[PDB]
Amino acid sequence: TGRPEWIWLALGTALMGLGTLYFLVKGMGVSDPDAKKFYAITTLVPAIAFTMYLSMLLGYGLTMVPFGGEQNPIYWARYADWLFTTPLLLLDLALLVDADQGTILALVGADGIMIGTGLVGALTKVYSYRFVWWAISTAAMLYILYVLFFGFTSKAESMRPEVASTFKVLRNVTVVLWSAYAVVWLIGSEGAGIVPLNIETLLFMVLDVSAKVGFGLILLRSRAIFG
Ligand SMILES: *C/C=C(C)/C=C/C=C(C)/C=C/C1=C(C)CCCC1(C)C
C-alpha cells in the first residue's frame, strides 16, 4: 500500500523497540525486589506499543469508518495498545506514592471507560455522536488527571523528597501529554478531519514515545524505585 504515514509507524516501531530492550536489559540486572517491579511494568509498556506499531506498519489495526460523506481511515490498533499501556502507566505512578487499592481500582476503571468510549466514538457512524463519545472519553481523562494532581501528589508527600520529586516530573509529563491526546483526536481523523492522517500519525508517535520511553527513562533512572 505504502501510505503517507508509514514512515512515522516505522519510526514509532523502532523507538519502542530500542526502549524496550534497553529497559529489559537494565531491568534484569537489578536485584532489588521493588525496582524489579517498576522495571517489569515500564518495559512491558513500550513492548505492547512496539507490537501494535509493528502490526499497523504491516497493515493491520486499520478500518474504514463511514461518516461525513467519506470513508474514513481509523487506526483502531491504537486503542488495543492503550487499553493496556495507559493503566500500566497509572499503576507505575500509584506504586510510587503508595496509592491505596481503592484509588488504583478507580483509576484503572476510569481508564477503561476513557479508552472504551474513545474507540466506540472512533467507530461511530453518526458524525455528531462521535463527539458525544469523545466528550465522555475526555471527561473520564480529566477525572484521572484530577486524581493524579490532587490525590496522588498529596500522598507523595509522605514520601522522601527524592520520591516526591520524581513523581512531580512524571505527573507533569503525564498531564501535558495526556491532555494533548484529546485535542489530536478532535482535530484529526477521528474528529474534524482538519489535520491529515500522515501528520496525525506523527503527532501520535511523538506523544506515545514521550509518554512511554520518555516516562520510562525518567522513572527507571531514578532511585525512587528502590525498596
Ligand atoms: C502510551 C500511550 C499513552 C500514555 C496514551 C494516552 C492516551 C490518552 C490520554 C488518550 C485519550 C483519549 C481521549 C481523552 C478522548 C478521545 C480518545 C482518546 C482515547 C484518544
Mind explaining what this structure looks like?
Homotrimer. Light-driven proton pump. One of its GO terms (molecular function) is light-driven active monoatomic ion transmembrane transporter activity. With 227 residues, the protein is mainly alpha-helical. The chain has one domain: Up-down Bundle (Rhopdopsin 7-helix transmembrane proteins). 75% of the residues lie in helices and 5% in strands. Strands 1-2 form a two-stranded antiparallel ribbon. A hairpin with a 2-residue loop joins β1 and β2. α1 packs antiparallel against α2, α3 packs antiparallel against α4 and α4 packs antiparallel against α5. The longest helix is centred in the middle third of the chain and has 29 residues. The radius of gyration is 18 Å and the shape is globular. The site of retinal has 19 residues, from α3, α4, α5, α6 and α7. The site of retinal (RET) has 19 residues, from α3, α4, α5, α6 and α7.
What's the short story on this structure?
The PDB classes it as membrane protein. The chain has seven helices and two strands.
